[PDB]
Paper text:
Human dipeptidyl peptidase III (hDPP III), also known as enkephalinase B, is a member of the M49 family of zinc dependent metallopeptidases and cleaves dipeptides sequentially from the N-terminus of various bioactive peptide substrates. Crystal structures have so far been determined for DPP III from humans as well as from Saccharomyces cerevisiae. Despite the low sequence identity (36%) shared by the two proteins, both structures are very similar and consist of two lobes separated by a wide cleft. The “upper” lobe is mostly α-helical and contains the zinc binding site as well as the catalytically important residues. In both structures, two histidine residues (His-450 and His-455 in the human enzyme) and a glutamate (Glu-508) coordinate the zinc ion.
Met-enkephalin (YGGFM) and Leu-enkephalin (YGGFL) are endogenous opioid neurotransmitters which are found in the brains and spinal cords of many animals, including humans, and which have been shown to be cleaved by hDPP III1. In the complex structures, the N-termini of both peptides are anchored to the protein through hydrogen bonding and electrostatic interactions from the side chains of Tyr-318, Glu-316 and Asn-394. The first three amino acids form a β-strand, which interacts with the five-stranded β-core in an antiparallel fashion (through hydrogen bonds to Ala-388 to Asn-391). These interactions stabilize the extended conformation of the peptide, which would otherwise not be favoured due to the glycine residues at positions 2 and 3 of the enkephalins. One exception is His-568 from the upper lobe, which is hydrogen bonded to the carbonyl oxygen of the scissile peptide bond. Quite unexpectedly, the zinc ion does not directly interact with the P1 carbonyl of the peptide (the scissile peptide) but is at a distance of 3.7 Å and 3.6 Å for Met and Leu-enkephalin, respectively. Instead, a water molecule completes the tetrahedral coordination of the metal ion. In the complex with Met-enkephalin the zinc bound water molecule is situated right between the side chain of Glu-451 and the scissile amide bond. Despite the uncertainties regarding the exact conformation of Glu-451, this configuration can be considered structurally similar to the Michaelis complex and the water molecule is in a suitable position for the nucleophilic attack on the peptide group. In the case of efficiently cleaved peptides like the enkephalins, on the other hand, the reaction follows the energetically favoured and therefore faster water mediated hydrolysis pathway.
Author numbering:
A (entry chain A): 2 to 726
B (entry chain B): 1 to 5
Write the structure that this text describes.
């Protein structure tokens, strides 16, 4: 059984399978991929700074340790110093956890994790290490600085969050949701994207707060060729508050990023790739999200590349306020065969869109011809690797240029790990079906989720000229029967308006679309099941969704009344929608497991899915879209936070069930990624053991040119900001 | 947007 805030010694580890994809690449394509990979992995180190105050020091300390002694050499030292093999394994798993999350907080769940061995024994190991013999000042200073925080589970440190009860480095430690909202109002007022920004609040001698909005860039306060960003670098007064806009965040890291993007440009396959890379270079050099948007436009225009990539401060899941971007970058190789199913989904998409439970007036004006590919990841840098992506996030781009849907096939493969024993909360016969179809349904669900889910729905916008992007005169709100009374104004986005629920609410919507359209006797032909096979996917897909909603309670924090993972909160919401429909469609029952410990059972009534489930879901989905399109945050919050509410009300007793969900939880596995190395002429792919030690090695070998320089850089950047926390 | 699993 698992303990909260530690990675179990026996945590699963899998190695990404990238060899076949890599073998397909031409020499030029390999060099392109090589440099973009380096760009991504460099940039991923910024995520340490975006996670916790101590994370950059812990990375620097681990990096030092394993550069001097690999896992097998360090074993010999550690065991000679009194660690058991089990305690040494705990340290390897911890280090692998830090590497693979780019921080000492889980990317999926936002909870701290600490090494599962005595601090004093680890001290002995670190201070007697070869790293410490070579650089005693550097190693002692690092241990002094981060050793306490490496281990501390004081309540206020256990979860990421704003205010005094959680940790965040998107903001200084004295910031609250109030500060974040005020800053968002400011940012919006200056038409300045939050994505590549942080917010620091410092007080003067009289305790008056001053706000710094700091942009990520290579360049600092010195003048540069650009005008659009530099003209913004100044002080402002906003509702009585002093605001200064600065840049230079992560500068020497982003400098390495841009060096490699420049070199990749030499191997670009076409002018879209060359121009997109030039714009990203401008974005990271100057601190300009407008430049990132221009780059992103070129990227959408680059259709079906052999080497696909994206990079920057992309997703806003981990900002407690919900508008700032965590750095990520990926490089992936097209898989022609696996892409096929999604290409024909594109062949019935424009039609299937009409089947969603809102009027065409709430749907995008022009249906842009969809781009949906299956890729094999070579590099996915940052806090975690998703199974699929739908990007860019810039809604103005999404409506005028379009967007790309990507399914990551060799990541999907890993996620297809499910034993019967690990199939908790299911009755016996339900377990069988699950092992048969979960894999099949995933494409069904993820197909609909990205293309029809994130890809659907119009945002109602009023421009500076009070001229709407819809027909204010004839469009009718199907819930109220009235003409539209609210909309998005200039400079407002989905994230700025819905802030803390934006990510979860939209994931809920996309999931609901997938679940809804999975009922379609036709969609089960595009993926191809057309019978009892088709129906089996259905019962399983819905059984999976309701089981997932129960499992989701792991990611809820009762004391904070707070959900920590957007996708899990969304699945809980869908579960509660289906429970609300009543009529015995779904029940959750407390039980006792064969091990004598509390258990539970999820019961889904297949004979009431279309008669009860589907109209409940249709009504729900309609409501979601109407409030999103109209930017009605009060209504959207009221609706969503309502279903997301967790109580011990009968008959479900979700708070009690949560204790049982925690007792039987399984740790999400760590994924090892390969390296590419430029051995003179040729690029080679380096692969690693599927273990905590292989994961450590994969990072030990990841920066052979300048690893010690990166340790120094992270250490310096952390130290510059230390007063904020 | 990312699809996590
Ligand atoms: K968000
Ligand atoms: Mg805080
Ligand atoms: Mg991770
Ligand atoms: Zn999604």
């Amino acid at each position: 059984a698992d303990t909260q805030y530690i990675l179990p010694n026996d945590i699963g580890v899998s190695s990404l399978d990238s060899r076949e994809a890599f073998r397909l690449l031409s020499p030029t394509e390999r060099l392109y991929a090589y440099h973009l990979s380096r760009a991504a992995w460099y940039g991923g180190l910024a995520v340490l700074l975006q996670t916790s105050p101590e994370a950059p020091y812990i990375y620097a300390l681990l990096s030092r340790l394993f550069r001097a002694q690999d896992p097998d050499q360090l074993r010999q030292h550690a065991l000679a110093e009194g660690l058991t093999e089990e305690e040494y394994q705990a340290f390897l798993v911890y280090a692998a956890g830090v590497y693979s999350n780019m921080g000492n907080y889980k990317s999926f769940g936002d909870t701290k994790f600490v090494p599962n061995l005595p601090k004093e024994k680890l001290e002995r190991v670190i201070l007697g290490s070869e790293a410490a013999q070579q650089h005693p000042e550097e190693v002692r200073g690092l241990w002094q600085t981060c050793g306490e925080l490496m281990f501390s589970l004081e309540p206020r440190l256990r979860h990421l969050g704003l205010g005094k009860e959680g940790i965040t480095t998107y903001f200084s430690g004295n910031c609250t949701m109030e500060d974040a909202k005020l800053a968002q109002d400011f940012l919006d007022s200056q038409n300045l994207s939050a994505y590549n920004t942080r917010l620091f609040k410092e007080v003067d001698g009289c305790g008056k707060p001053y706000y710094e909005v700091r942009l990520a860039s290579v360049l600092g306060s010195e003048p540069s060729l650009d005008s659009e960003v530099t003209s913004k670098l100044k002080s402002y007064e906003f509702r009585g508050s002093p605001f200064q806009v600065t840049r230079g965040d992560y500068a020497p890291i982003l400098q390495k990023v841009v060096e490699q993007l420049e070199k990749a440009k030499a191997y670009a396959a076409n002018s879209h790739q060359g121009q997109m890379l030039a714009q990203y270079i401008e974005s990271f050099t100057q601190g300009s999200i407008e430049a990132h948007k221009r780059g992103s436009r070129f990227w959408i225009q680059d259709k079906g590349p052999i080497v696909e990539s994206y990079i920057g401060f992309i997703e806003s899941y981990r900002d407690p306020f919900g508008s700032r971007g965590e750095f990520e970058g990926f490089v992936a190789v097209v898989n022609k065969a696996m892409s096929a199913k999604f290409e024909r989904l594109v062949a019935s998409a424009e039609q299937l869109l009409k089947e969603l439970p809102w009027p065409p007036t709430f749907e995008k004006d022009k249906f842009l011809t969809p781009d949906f590919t299956s890729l094999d990841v070579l590099t996915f840098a940052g806090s975690g690797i998703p199974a699929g992506i739908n990007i860019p996030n810039y809604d103005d781009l999404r409506q005028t240029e379009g967007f790309k849907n990507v399914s990551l096939g060799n990541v999907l493969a890993v996620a297809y790990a499910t034993q019967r024993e690990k199939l908790t909360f299911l009755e016996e016969d339900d377990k069988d079906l699950y092992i048969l179809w979960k894999g099949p349904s995933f494409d069904v669900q993820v197909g609909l989720h990205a293309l029809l889910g994130h890809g659907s729905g119009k945002l109602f916008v009023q421009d500076e000229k009070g001229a709407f992007n819809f027909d204010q005169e004839t469009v009718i709100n199907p819930e109220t029967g009235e003409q539209i009374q609210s909309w998005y104004r200039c400079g407002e986005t989905w994230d700025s308006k819905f802030s803390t629920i934006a990510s979860s609410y939209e994931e809920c919507r996309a999931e609901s679309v997938g679940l809804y359209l999975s009922l379609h006797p036709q969609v089960l032909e595009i993926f191809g099941f057309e019978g009892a096979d088709a129906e089996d996917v259905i019962y399983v897909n819905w059984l999976n969704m309701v089981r997932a909603g129960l499992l989701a309670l792991e990611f809820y924090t009762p004391e904070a009344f707070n959900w920590r993972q957007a996708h899990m909160q969304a699945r809980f919401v869908i579960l509660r929608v289906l429970l609300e429909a009543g009529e015995g469609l779904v029940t959750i029952t407390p039980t006792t497991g064969s091990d004598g410990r509390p258990d539970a059972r999820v019961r889904l009534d297949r004979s009431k899915i279309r008669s009860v489930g589907k109209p409940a879901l249709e009504r729900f989905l309609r409501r979601l879209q109407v409030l999103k399109s109209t930017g009605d945050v009060a209504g959207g919050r009221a609706l969503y936070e309502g279903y997301a509410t967790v109580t011990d009300a009968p008959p479900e007793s979700f708070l009690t069930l949560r204790d049982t969900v925690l007792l039987r939880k399984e740790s999400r596995k760590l994924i090892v990624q390969p390296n590419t190395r430029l051995e003179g002429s040729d690029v080679q792919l380096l692969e690693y053991e599927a273990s905590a030690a292989g994961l450590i090695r994969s990072f030990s070998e990841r920066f052979p040119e300048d690893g010690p320089e990166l340790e120094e850089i992270l250490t310096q950047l952390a130290t510059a900001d230390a007063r904020f926390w | 947007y990312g699809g996590f699993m």
